[PDB]
Amino acid sequence: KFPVVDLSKLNGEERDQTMALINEACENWGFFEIVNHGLPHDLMDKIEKMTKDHYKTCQEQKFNDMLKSKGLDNLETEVEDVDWESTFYVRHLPQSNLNDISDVSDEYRTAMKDFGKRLENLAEDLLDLLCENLGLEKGYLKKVFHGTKGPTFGTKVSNYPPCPKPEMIKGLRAHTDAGGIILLFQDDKVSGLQLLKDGDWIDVPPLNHSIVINLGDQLEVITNGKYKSVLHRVVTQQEGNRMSVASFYNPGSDAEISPATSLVEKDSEYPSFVFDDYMKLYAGVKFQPKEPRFAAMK
Amino acid sequence: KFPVVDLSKLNGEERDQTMALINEACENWGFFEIVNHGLPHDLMDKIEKMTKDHYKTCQEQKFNETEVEDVDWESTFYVRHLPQSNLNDISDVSDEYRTAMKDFGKRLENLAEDLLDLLCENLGLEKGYLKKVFHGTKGPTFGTKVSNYPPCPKPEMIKGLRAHTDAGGIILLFQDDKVSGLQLLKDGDWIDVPPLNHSIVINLGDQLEVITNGKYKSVLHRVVTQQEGNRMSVASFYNPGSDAEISPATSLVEKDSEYPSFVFDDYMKLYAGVKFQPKEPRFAAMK
Amino acid sequence: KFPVVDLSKLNGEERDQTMALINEACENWGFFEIVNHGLPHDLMDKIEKMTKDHYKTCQEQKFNDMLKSKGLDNLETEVEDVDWESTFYVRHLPQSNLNDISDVSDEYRTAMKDFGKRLENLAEDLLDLLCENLGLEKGYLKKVFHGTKGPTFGTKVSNYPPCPKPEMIKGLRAHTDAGGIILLFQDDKVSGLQLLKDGDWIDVPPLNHSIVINLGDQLEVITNGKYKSVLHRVVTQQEGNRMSVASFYNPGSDAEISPATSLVEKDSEYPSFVFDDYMKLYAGVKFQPKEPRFAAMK
Amino acid sequence: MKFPVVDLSKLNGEERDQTMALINEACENWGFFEIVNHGLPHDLMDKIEKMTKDHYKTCQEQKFNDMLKSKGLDNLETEVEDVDWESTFYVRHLPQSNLNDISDVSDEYRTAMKDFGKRLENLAEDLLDLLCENLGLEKGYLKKVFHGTKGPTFGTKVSNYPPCPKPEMIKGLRAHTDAGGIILLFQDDKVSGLQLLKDGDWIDVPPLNHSIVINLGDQLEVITNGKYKSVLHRVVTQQEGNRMSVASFYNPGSDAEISPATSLVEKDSEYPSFVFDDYMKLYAGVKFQPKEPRFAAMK
Amino acid sequence: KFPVVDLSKLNGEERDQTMALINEACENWGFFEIVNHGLPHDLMDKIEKMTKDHYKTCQEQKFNDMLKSKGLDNLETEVEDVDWESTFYVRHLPQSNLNDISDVSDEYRTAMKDFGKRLENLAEDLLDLLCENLGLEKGYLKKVFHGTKGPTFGTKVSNYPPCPKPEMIKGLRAHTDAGGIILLFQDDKVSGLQLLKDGDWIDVPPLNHSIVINLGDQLEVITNGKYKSVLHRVVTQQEGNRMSVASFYNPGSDAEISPATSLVEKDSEYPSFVFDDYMKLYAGVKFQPKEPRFAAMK
Ligand SMILES: O=C(O)c1ccccn1
Ligand SMILES: O=C(O)c1ccccn1
Ligand SMILES: O=C(O)c1ccccn1
Ligand SMILES: O=C(O)c1ccccn1
Ligand SMILES: O=C(O)c1ccccn1
Ligand SMILES: [Zn+2]
Ligand SMILES: [Zn+2]
Ligand SMILES: [Zn+2]
Ligand SMILES: [Zn+2]
Ligand SMILES: [Zn+2]
C-alpha cells in the first residue's frame, strides 16, 4: 500500500506515529503522498485548471511541432531516446523568471507565485522532519542546501498527452532525480507516474488535493545511503492527458554536499562534492544508471 | 607597480591586453596577483577563518639573541591532494575545515590548469602542453602548505622564511589581506607582494623556467616577520608527477639550451637538501 | 548599483562627475561609500584589529551574560523589541569621555583619538561638498551645526556576533539616524547593513579601507527634503561577527535647525527647532516611524 | 500605450506631485504629450483656427495648387520622398518680430497671432520650469541656457495639409526630429495626421479640441544627457480633410552655449557641447536625415 | 580599438575566443575586419589593380560627366543630396550580368567571378558563425535567406576620387545597409569609411589584405535587435582616390524575414515581412532614418 501521510497529525499526540510513517516511507519507498498539507484546495484547483488551459493555449501546438520534428507521428517501433512529454520550467529561486515567461496569463503567474512560495515553505518544513527522523540538528539540511545564494527552487510544469501506441514510448523514461526534495502536484484522474520497488513498477496513485513527495540524489549522499533516491517513470496511455506540476528544492550551486558525519561510521561509499559539479554531469546522463554519477564525484 | 591581473578581462576585446600583462609578469616579475578568478569569496572567507582559528587552537601553544639565518619563524602543516589525498588523515583538522579544503583545493587545481593554458598561449605552445608534460604516470602532484607567521619581537634577526625559489610548476597563494610579509626580489630590490582581499598570488617555479628555456624565470622570494600581526598563508603547489620528463620545449629553443633535461623527482630529491642555496647549481646538477 | 565615490577624482574635471555622483546618492540613496578618503590604511587596520580584540576580551562574555538575562538563548519565536548587538559609545565632542571607557588599552585610546580627529576633518570636508551641490555657501552646514559649544561628535563601536537563528532577530532594527552625517568604518568581510530603497532591502557591500557615508534627519530638515534620511538596518547571520565603528557628526545641542531659506520656495513642511529637543524625543521613538518626529517639533 | 494627456490645472492643488510625475514619464517615454486646461483662452484658439483656415482658402490654396503645377505633382504616378505635401508660412516673434511684414494677413489675424504667441511663449517658459523641477535643475536653468545674448528664438509655423488624392505616394511632412527646445502645437481638432514613432510603431497624436501638443527638440536631448530624447514624427496626408497646424518653436538664442547639464553627467557624455547656431546651420541641410550624425558633427 | 578577427584561429583551440570577439563586434560595433580569411593575396592584389585601372579607363569619364550635369565642379557651399562617388554594380546571384558589362576586360571578369564565389562562400561561413553565437540551428540564416531563387549576391565597385573641398560633400552619406551581410574589400592606403559608435564617427582603418564585415537591416530583424545595423558613411579628402569593392549577400526577393522565435520573449518590436517589399521601400528612403522603415513593414 502506497504511503499516504496526514500532515495535520503532526500537531498533536499522533505526531510520533506520523514521523515514524514518514521515516519508513523515506527508507523503503523513496516516495510518499501527503494530505492536509496546508495548501488551499482552492489554489490547487485553479493551478490545475490554468495549467490545463495553458496546455491547450500554449503547449499543445509546441508538442505536436515536436512529434513532427522527430517523426513520432507514427510509432511502429519502440522509442527509447525521447519522452512523450510537454514541459516548460518556472524558476523561483534564487532569481525568479516568472514575470518573463511571455505566454502565461497574469492570474496564472499570480497563482504560480503563491503556489511556489507555499511549496517552498512546505519543502523546508519537510526537511526539518527528515532532520528529526535522522537525528540531525534542526535546520541542518536547510543550511547544507543554502550555499552562497540560497537554495535553487523551480517548478516543472508538464503534460503527458494521450499516446496512440503507449507500448512504444514512455511519457518520461526511468530515472532518479538529481536534487534534494521534490513536491509534486499531479493529475487526480489520469494515472501514469510509477516507482520501482522490490523489482516491481508501482503506481503512484492519483489522489485529490494531495502532494507527492520524493527524495533526490543529494539526500541519498547526505544520509549516507539511509534514504535512497528511487527510480521512477511516467507511462503514457491512449486516453487521457496527465497533468504534472513538480517543484524541485535543490541545493545552491556552490553548496558543499557530503555525508553527514553523525550518519557515517565506516568510511562512506558516497562522495563529497559541490552540487553544481553534480548537476553539470547529471544533465547529460540523466537516463543512465545513478551509481556511476556518485563514483564520478570522487 | 605590482601586476594585478583581472581574469574577468579575458573574454573580450580587452583580452589581448590582459594576456600581455600576464606575459609581462611571467617574464619580468615571476609573480602576479589575480582578481575575479572564479573562486567563491565565501569559500575564501571560510578558509581564512578556519585557518586562523586552527592556528590558535592547535599550533600557537606548540609554537611557543643575534642574527638567525638558519631557522624560519614559521608554523606550518601540509595537505596533499594529488596524486593521492591525505586530507582525511590529518588528525587535528575539523570536519568543516576538511570539507572546505577539499572544495578549495579542487577549485585551485582547475584554476592552476586554466593558468597553465594561458601560459601556453603566451608561449606559442599548444593548449594542454604544460598539463601533459606535468602528468607523468600518476598525474600532477598537488598539495597545500598552510602557514602562519606569528609576531616576532626582533624581525631584523630572523626571517619568517628565507629567500628561495620554488622547485615546482605553478604556485597559487591565498595570503593574509591585512598583514604583509611576502617579498620578491626584482632588479636588485626587495618588493612587497601587497596584501589584497579575495586575491590569489601566482608565481612560477623552477620547472617552468626549464620548460620555457629561461623565458619565464622562477624569482627569489622570502617572508619577513613583523612585531605585531600573524600573517596567514595558504599556498598550493601544482607540480609535475614524480616521473615526468622535464625539458625545454623544442619550439622555444633555437641555440642549444643551457637548461637540462631530467625527471622531476630527481630534481625534487636534490632540492630538499639545498633549498636555500643558489638555484643555478641545481640546474647544472641535472646534467 | 551601490554608489562608490572616489574622492581622488575631485582633482580634475572628473570633479563635476564626482560631485554629480555624490548629489545623486544624496537624493536617491541616502548612503554612499567613499574610497581614497585620506584616512591611513594602517590606522584603519589597527582600529579594526583592536576593536575585534576588545570585543573578544571584554564584550563577548558580557554579551553572552545578556542573552541569559533576556532569554535570547532559545529563539523559538520572533523578537522584534531587541537588537542582537554589542556596543559601547565614545564621545569626542563637545566633551570627550575617551579616558573613561575602562577596559580599553592606552594604544586603543590613542588610536581612536587619532582616528576620530581624522574622521571629524573628513566629515567637515564632506559637508562642504554637500554645500556646493546644494548651492549653499561654503561652511554653511558646519556653521549651522556649531551651536555654542561646537558640533556633537561621537563614535559607536558595535559588533554583531553570530546568531543561531537570524530569521528571528535583527542585529539592529530599521531606523533612520537622528543626526547630521554618519561616517561608518564597517567589517570588510561580514555583511549585514542594509538600506531601504524603492521598496527593497539593499546590502551596503563590505569594501576594504572604505568609509560608508549616510545622512541623518537633521540634513533632511536643512535641505527641505532634498536629501532624505533613509531607513537602514543590520541583519544577523549564523557564522560571522560584523564589526561597526560608526562616527556621528551632529549639531551642537543648542543648535537651531531649520530648512535653509535658499532651498525653500513653497513654505516648508519641515519644522524649525533646537537639536537637543529633537534628540530627547528621538531616544524614545528611534525604531518608530520618522515622520511623526518632524511633526512633533512644531 | 494610451497617448499622454496632462491636465495642467492639477498643478495648482493637492495633485501637483502626481501631475509632475506624469509629465516626467511622457518626457522620458513619449517625447510628446497633450496638455488641457493650459490657460490659453478657448475663444482665442477658436479665432486663430478660423482665421488660419480662412487665410489658407483665400490666400494659400491658389499658391498650393500652383506649387503642384510647377513641380508636376498633379500626377502622383510614383512615390515622392523629397517633397512635403504642405502649405506653410513662418512668423518670427523673437528676437525680432516680422509679424508686421507679412503682407497677406489681416490686421485682426496679425493681432490675434501676436497675442497667441505671447501666451505660448509664457507657457513655454512655464513648461521649461516644470522640466527643470523634474530633472533636479534649478528654477530658470533652461530659460537661462536658452537666452544667449539676445534672448531665445521664438517663431510660429502656420501650416495646412490639404487633401491629397493618393496619400500613399507623398507625406504631408517627412519624418524628422525638431532641432530646437520645446515645441507647442495647436493642431486641427477634427483632421488627424501627426504621428510619432514609439517602440517601432507610428502612433497618431489624436486631435483633441482646445488642447496643445507639446514635444521636445534635439537641444533638450543634449541638455538632459539623453534622459529626454527628441522623437521622430511625421504628418501623413488623407484623401479628404485639410489638417491645420499652428506650431510654435521655443529655441535657444543663436549664440547660446548648449551642453549636457553638469549634475546629470556622472560619466563622460556621448553628447557634444556646441553653440546653437552651428547646430541650426547644419540641421537646415540634413533635417530629414538621421538625428545621431548631427550630434556627432558637433564634436 | 576597432575589432580585427583572425579567422584562421577558428580551426583550433582558440576558436571560442575568436567566436566571442565576433559576437562582441556584432553586438557593439556592427562592423569588424577579418584577416587570414580564405582569399589569396594575389587575387586581392589583382582585383585592386584592375579596379583602379578600370576607374581610369572607364569610370573617370562618367564621373566628370556626373559633375558636369550636377554642377559640382566648384563647391561654394554644402551639398547634402548627392554622393561624391563613382560606381558600377556587378550581379552574381541569382543571375550574373558579369558577361554583359561591356567595358570590363576578360581577365577582370575572370578575377571578379573568382572573387565573388569566394566571398559568397565566406558570407555563408560567417552566417553560420552568427547562428552559433545566436544559439540558432546551423544553416538557419542561409535557409531564411534562400526564398525560391536563392540569395541575392552582387558587388558594388566604387571609387571616391579626391574632392577639392571635402567639407562640402560626402563620398557617401550616412546610412544603414538594407541587406544581410556585407563584405568589403577597401583601399589599404586611402581611408574614408566611418561608422557611428557611442556618439562618435570612428574610422574603419585601411588594412592590407583584409575584409571589412558589417551587418544590414535584415539581420537586425532576424536577431530581434540583438545585432543592430549601424550607420556608416564615406568622407572625401583632397588627395587620394579610395577604392571600394563591396559585396552584398541579401535574402532572395520572396524570402520571409521575421525575428527568429528563439530570440523573442516579449512581443517583438520588429516586423515580419517579405524582403522585396523592404527593398522597394528602402531604395527611395536610403538616407532617411532607419527606424521608420521597420514601422512601415507592419
Ligand atoms: O519530472 C520528473 O523528473 C519528476 C516529476 C515529479 C516527481 C518526480 N520526478
Ligand atoms: O612557502 C613557499 O615557499 C611559498 C609560499 C607561497 C608562495 C610562494 N612560496
Ligand atoms: O547604529 C546605527 O544607527 C548606524 C551605524 C552605522 C551607520 C548608520 N547607522
Ligand atoms: O513642423 C514640425 O516640424 C512640427 C510641427 C508641430 C509639432 C512638431 N513638429
Ligand atoms: O556602399 C555601401 O553602402 C557600403 C560599402 C561597403 C561597406 C558598407 N557599405
Ligand atoms: Zn523525476
Ligand atoms: Zn616559495
Ligand atoms: Zn543608523
Ligand atoms: Zn517637427
Ligand atoms: Zn552601406
Numbering used by the authors:
A (entry chain B), C (entry chain F), E (entry chain C): 6 to 303
B (entry chain H): 6 to 69, 81 to 303
D (entry chain A): 5 to 303
Sentences from the paper on this structure:
ACC is then oxidized by the ACC oxidase (ACCO or ACO, referred to as ACO in this study), giving rise to ethylene, carbon dioxide (CO2) and cyanide3. ACO enzyme is a 2OG-oxygenase ‘related' enzyme that belongs to the cupin superfamily, which uses a non-heme ferrous iron (Fe2+) as a cofactor and facilitates the integration of molecular oxygen into a myriad of biomolecules. ACO uses ascorbate, rather than 2-oxoglutarate as the co-substrate, and requires CO2, one of the products of the ACO reaction, as an activator. Overall, the structure of AtACO2 resembles the Petunia hybrid ACO (PhACO), featuring a double-stranded-helix jellyroll fold surrounded by α-helices.
